[PDB]
Enzyme design. Structure first.
Site, PDB file in Angstrom:
ATOM      1  N   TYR A   8       0.598   6.677   3.827  1.00  0.00           N
ATOM      2  CA  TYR A   8       0.712   7.943   4.491  1.00  0.00           C
ATOM      3  C   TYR A   8       1.738   7.936   5.638  1.00  0.00           C
ATOM      4  CZ  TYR A   8      -2.641   5.587   7.567  1.00  0.00           C
ATOM      5  OH  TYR A   8      -3.232   4.685   8.401  1.00  0.00           O
ATOM      6  N   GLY A   9       1.525   7.100   6.627  1.00  0.00           N
ATOM      7  CA  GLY A   9       2.395   7.104   7.769  1.00  0.00           C
ATOM      8  C   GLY A   9       3.410   5.998   7.750  1.00  0.00           C
ATOM      9  N   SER A  10       3.133   4.973   8.520  1.00  0.00           N
ATOM     10  CA  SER A  10       4.041   3.866   8.747  1.00  0.00           C
ATOM     11  C   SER A  10       4.421   3.133   7.443  1.00  0.00           C
ATOM     12  CB  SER A  10       3.393   2.901   9.764  1.00  0.00           C
ATOM     13  OG  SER A  10       4.212   1.781  10.068  1.00  0.00           O
ATOM     14  N   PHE A  11       3.481   3.012   6.529  1.00  0.00           N
ATOM     15  CA  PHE A  11       3.727   2.270   5.293  1.00  0.00           C
ATOM     16  C   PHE A  11       4.224   3.142   4.146  1.00  0.00           C
ATOM     17  CE2 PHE A  11       0.345  -0.796   6.948  1.00  0.00           C
ATOM     18  CZ  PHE A  11       1.288  -1.666   7.450  1.00  0.00           C
ATOM     19  N   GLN A  12       4.712   4.337   4.432  1.00  0.00           N
ATOM     20  CA  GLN A  12       5.181   5.197   3.358  1.00  0.00           C
ATOM     21  C   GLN A  12       6.654   4.861   3.016  1.00  0.00           C
ATOM     22  OE1 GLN A  12       4.636   9.906   2.132  1.00  0.00           O
ATOM     23  NE2 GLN A  12       5.635   9.432   4.061  1.00  0.00           N
ATOM     24  N   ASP A  13       7.153   3.814   3.614  1.00  0.00           N
ATOM     25  CA  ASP A  13       8.519   3.372   3.407  1.00  0.00           C
ATOM     26  C   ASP A  13       8.525   1.955   2.840  1.00  0.00           C
ATOM     27  OD1 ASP A  13      11.598   3.647   4.221  1.00  0.00           O
ATOM     28  OD2 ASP A  13      10.902   1.704   4.928  1.00  0.00           O
ATOM     29  N   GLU A  40      -3.524  -1.449  10.286  1.00  0.00           N
ATOM     30  CA  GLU A  40      -3.923  -0.034  10.342  1.00  0.00           C
ATOM     31  C   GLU A  40      -5.263   0.145  11.054  1.00  0.00           C
ATOM     32  OE1 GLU A  40      -0.923   1.086   9.580  1.00  0.00           O
ATOM     33  OE2 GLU A  40      -1.626   2.599   8.195  1.00  0.00           O
TER      34      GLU A  40
END
Length: 149
Positions: A14-19, A82
């Protein structure tokens, strides 16, 4: 799915790990990513004080990505990273490939009543104009009713 998720894990990001680039760095490699839809949840958006979070929204759905084929050390490491402000929960996501549903882990925002995360996500705004895409087939239907549009 052909990534074999037995001892390997799959998580909806969703956030930080969406890349994937941050994934190669934070662990080593990037598990096979699939576009998936998480119905019954909503992602909010912000960066700085607070970040894109996931909360249960009956009227929402989150289109995001799933990292499948991640190893267990990293899986616990994700929980460690997380877990500082999120909890690891199990959710049902739908393949944006077919219409298949899967059960994966994701990190959900623990504080369900939070005014800081309050912001409309891109997809919510798009969901609004996305309606028009359906409306286009209806727009012709007005001809039968009284006035062709």
């Amino acid at each position: 799915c052909s990534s074999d998720s037995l001892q390997l894990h799959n998580v909806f990001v969703y956030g930080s790990f969406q890349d994937p680039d941050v994934i190669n760095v934070m662990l080593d490699r990037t598990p096979e990513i699939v576009s998936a839809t998480l119905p019954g949840f909503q992602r909010f958006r912000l960066k700085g004080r607070l970040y894109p979070c996931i909360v249960p929204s009956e009227k929402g759905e989150v289109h995001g990505k799933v990292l499948m084929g991640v190893t267990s050390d990293e899986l616990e490491n994700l929980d460690a990273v997380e877990g500082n402000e999120y909890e690891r929960v199990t959710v049902g996501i739908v393949r944006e490939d077919n219409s298949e549903k899967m059960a994966v882990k994701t990190y959900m925002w623990i504080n369900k009543a939070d005014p800081d995360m309050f912001g409309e996500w891109n997809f919510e705004e798009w969901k609004r104009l996305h309606k028009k895409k359906f409306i286009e087939t209806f727009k012709k239907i007005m001809e039968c009713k009284k006035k062709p549009q």
